[PDB]
Amino acid sequence: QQPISTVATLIEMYTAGRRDFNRAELGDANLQNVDIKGSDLSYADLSTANLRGANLRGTDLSFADLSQADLQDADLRGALLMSANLRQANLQGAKLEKADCDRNTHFPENFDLLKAGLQLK
């Protein structure tokens, strides 16, 4: 195997039933409105990815680089965000209720974790 490095391939495999996309290199991927719920994206590079409206429910995004990702209106409910880098992510309208984080998750500056519904882990 190899880490996935293209949208086409990610989406082809995901509908093939694959869910391990550990270490995916998708740093500038256009993933607007995709449904990849339940995928393992831990350690992925999504640093300038367009994830607007994406369904990321129940995904494992631990250690992922989402530092300047566009997550507007994305669904992250139940996702694992421990040690993820969301430092300058656009989280407007994103749904984070019951997503899990830890002391090492880097959220944006004014981001209200309580109102967002985050859980510690």
TrEMBL record:
Q: Which organism is it from?
A: Nostoc sp. (strain PCC 7120 / SAG 25.82 / UTEX 2576)
User: What protein name does the entry list?
Assistant: Alr5209 protein
